[PDB]
Amino acid sequence: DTAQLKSQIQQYLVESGNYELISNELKARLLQEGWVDKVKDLTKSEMNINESTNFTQILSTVEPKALEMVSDSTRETVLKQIREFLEEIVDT
Amino acid sequence: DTAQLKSQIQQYLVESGNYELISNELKARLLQEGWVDKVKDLTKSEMNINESTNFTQILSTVEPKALEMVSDSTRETVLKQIREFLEEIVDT
Amino acid sequence: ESIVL
Amino acid sequence: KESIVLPTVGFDFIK
Amino acid sequence: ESIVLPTVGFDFIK
Amino acid sequence: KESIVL
Amino acid sequence: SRKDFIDTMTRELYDAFLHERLYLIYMDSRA
Amino acid sequence: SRKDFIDTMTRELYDAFLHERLYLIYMDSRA
């Protein structure tokens, strides 16, 4: 049921509208830090050096560097909001 | 590379516009057959038997029945279109 | 453990 | 604005 | 104008 | 070995 | 064979399309 | 126990959100 619990989380996350809000906020925030443009320019330039450019391939070279570049403000705000949602949904 | 090839397929499947086309066709067709309404009423009653209404939970009881209700026309038309696309993308 | 809405 | 926002295939929470 | 992305439901991989 | 051509 | 490769890839994609279609009916049904 | 559950569930959801965000940049970038 471990994989079935994740379905219930994702289920309620989307239906309650929290998925929309968080994905929207996270876009707006990452966009203002210039984190979008920084990650965008890296993927674009990563695409030009290598002829065959597969997503899972460039994911491994861009993802780890991109996580840390997330401003601490943004990362903590989102993590908080996620946990607050989880805290209400998970049972005692 | 098996999981990495599926990434390339899906990549080109979406970028080439075939994902859009096929999902729309598949919607329009299944909608006219009344396959939607049949699966619609089926999920609803499947949700009513069990208090906890999870997608993955009902999926095991609804998915197999829904495939077979797909008109022979539709199933073959889509399978054909999918294969035709694959045949061009995969190399010899 | 459990998920109650 | 009328229907619910579903995550894209990119949202890989499950698997 | 933009490209149509599949939803989370389109589970080609896994 | 299986290849993907655009 | 290459024939068997596309055979599985076909079914998996067909399933994905229908799996998604079900999900959308599930989510739309809870409305 | 429950505390450890939410901790991982949080990180996994956070990662999904960002993973998706990358994907949208990848796809939008190839345009």
CATH number at residue A67: 1.10.246.140
What six digits make up the tokens of B67?
């495939």
Decide: A66 and A39 in contact? Cβ < 8 Å.
yes
Nearest to D13 among H12, H21, H22 (CB): H12
Name chain D contacts of A10, Cβ cutoff 8 Å.
13-14
Query: Can you list the alpha helix ranges (DSSP code H) found in chain B?
Result: 2-15, 18-32, 35-49, 55-69, 72-89
Q: Does E4 touch chain B (CB under 8 A)?
A: yes
Name chain D contacts of E8, Cβ cutoff 8 Å.
6-9, 11, 13
Residue D12 φ/ψ, nearest 5 degrees: -100, 55
Q: Does D3 touch chain E (CB under 8 A)?
A: no
Touching D: H residues 1-31, CB under 8 Å: 12-13, 16-17, 19-24
Residue D6 φ/ψ, nearest 5 degrees: -95, 140
Mutate to test the interface with D, among E2, E5, E7 (most CBs of D within 10 A): E7
Overall number of domains in chain B: 1
Q: How far are the Cα atoms of A75, A77, B23 from residue A65, in angstroms, in the given order?
A: 14, 20, 35
Decide: B62 and B81 in contact? Cβ < 8 Å.
no
Hunting for tokens 């290849």 — which residue is that? F3
Decide: D6 and G27 in contact? Cβ < 8 Å.
yes
What six digits make up the tokens of B13?
């499947």
Resolution (A): 3.0
Measured in angstroms, the CA of H30 and the nearest CA of chain B are apart by: 9
Per-residue HEC secondary structure of H1-31 comes to CHHHHHHHHHHHHHHHHHHHHHHHHHHHHCC
State whether A79 and H29 contact (CB < 8 Å): no
Integer Cα distance of B24 and B22 in angstroms? 5
- The number of residues in chain G equals 31
Q: Domain range for residue B16? A: 1-92
Three-state secondary structure call for residue B92: coil
Measured in angstroms, the CA of B5 and the nearest CA of chain E are apart by: 10
Residue type, position E5, single letter:
L
Output b/e per residue, B41-55; b: 16+ Cβ within 10 A. ebbeebbeeeeebbb
Neighbours of chain F (3+ CB pairs under 8 A): B
- CA A55 to chain centroid: 16
List, in order, residues 6 or more apart from B15 with CB less than 8 Å away.
E3, H27, H30
Three-state secondary structure call for residue A10: helix
- Residues A73, A74, A76, A81: is their CA dihedral positive or negative? positive
How many other CB atoms are found less than 10 A from the CB of residue B67? 14
What six digits make up the tokens of A15?
């239906």
Residue B44 φ/ψ, nearest 5 degrees: -60, -45
Residue B32 φ/ψ, nearest 5 degrees: -80, -35
Listing DSSP states for A29-87 in one string gives HHHHTTHHHHHHHHHHHHHHH-SS--HHHHHHHHHHHHHHHS-HHHHHHHHHHHHHHHH
